[PDB]
Design a protein around this ligand. Sequence first.
Ligand code: HEM
Ligand SMILES: NCc1ccc(-c2cccnc2)o1
Length: 465
Amino acid sequence: KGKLPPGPTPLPFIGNYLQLNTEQMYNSLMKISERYGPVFTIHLGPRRVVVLCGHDAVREALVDQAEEFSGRGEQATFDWVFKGYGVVFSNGERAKQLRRFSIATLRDFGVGKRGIEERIQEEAGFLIDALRGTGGANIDPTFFLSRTVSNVISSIVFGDRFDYKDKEFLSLLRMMLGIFQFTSTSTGQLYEMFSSVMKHLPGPQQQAFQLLQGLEDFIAKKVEHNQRTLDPNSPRDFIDSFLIRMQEEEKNPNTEFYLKNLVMTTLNLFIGGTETVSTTLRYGFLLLMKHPEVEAKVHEEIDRVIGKNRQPKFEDRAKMPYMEAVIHEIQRFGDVIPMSLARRVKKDTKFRDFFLPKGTEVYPMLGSVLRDPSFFSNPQDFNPQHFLNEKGQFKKSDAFVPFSIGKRNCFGEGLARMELFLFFTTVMQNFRLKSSQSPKDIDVSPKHVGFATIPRNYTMSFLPR
Ligand code: HEM
Ligand SMILES: NCc1ccc(-c2cccnc2)o1
């Protein structure tokens, strides 16, 4: 046809705003999908976006035409501070350069090796101590979990972990939680459409920018310190490595290795490597309390395979199919980044029967793939069986795409999975979960859903076993 995917007729500037509920972007788009198809065009304010719903559409584009869909789209709130710099929100040469270096440097500091595994085990140990410190009292787990998670990636980029009593550390975690919630509210999704006006208007978006600026200032501060103490022969962390590469590229006019890309890339890892996993853990514990039978089987498998003495190690996952199914189901049900991070066609593209002009933005609806009724029998329920065969053995699914897929997929996936398995397992090994209310009354529906899926606030107690 040579034409863009079908979709509701947009109005000047506001686009399809009148046919969308900013507080429920996902449901609005899915409803529109019922009449236009799994592949349609939507106008988020002036942003023309091609929406991909369901496993087939998403995989066909991001994997089968991986290079064509390898461009990075926008996320207005984050672009406020990033401005196209850094590894995540960058495109072309800058993205290729920063991503290759980041993956390599991450591996140099233990990611994927025994080095980081030991780091996660030790930090898991610190979480256990902290949980024991609550004396079984009812608590908000939120920051107990984010502190532990953040310390893993923090060890890599800053060279050392934060003290759990570090007030400034708590401030930063609050900033990350704040930005994740904002981008998932009605105002945050409205911002994605009308940032051209809103970035200049009073409102919640301004407070959001301040949280981001607070994070950037902290990073800039850390970089400055490392600069005034850098050992070119012995890098201490991710920042040092980049600083070294920068020195080596000082004679290259068009190098991508300069201060701003260092600050933004480090900020990317600090935020991206913290809040995502933290959120998953938080939702996970809530779901396990909502389903005692699942916790029971988890404990059964842990006691048998690992016991009550030694610390869980990453290799234990191979001998624990149920736990593997449980973590997968948590990520599937959790649907933490419901619409992924926007992609964009790098050149004129022919997708299925449509035409996508170069630069077109793309919304891979990851949540629609994680609940694709063709891949999971009861997508709306939380059931580990979704990842298990009759034999109780772990069964993979092509529809398991919480980290997205393709050329700009999450390269933090390996670390994330090691953290999820080690933290979930070490916690369940040591504690029994006690909810504030009867299971049947626990609400596992999300508090907010926009850029991310945010679970409702809750308290709980960790009872030693
Ligand atoms: C449960 C945890 C996590 C989830 C659900 C998650 C999810 C995602 C998603 C959906 C994307 C976009 C993929 C795409 O464009 O196709 C992504 C990007 C990215 N993630 Fe994660 N992530 C997680 C953890 C991590 C961790 C631990 C790190 C940091 C070490 C990290 C770093 C990144 C980076 C740097 C990108 C941008 C990649 C690029 O543009 O080339 N993520 N993540
Ligand atoms: N790891 C995926 C993910 C979710 C949100 C973000 C993020 C947000 C702000 C800056 N850099 C990365 O990254």
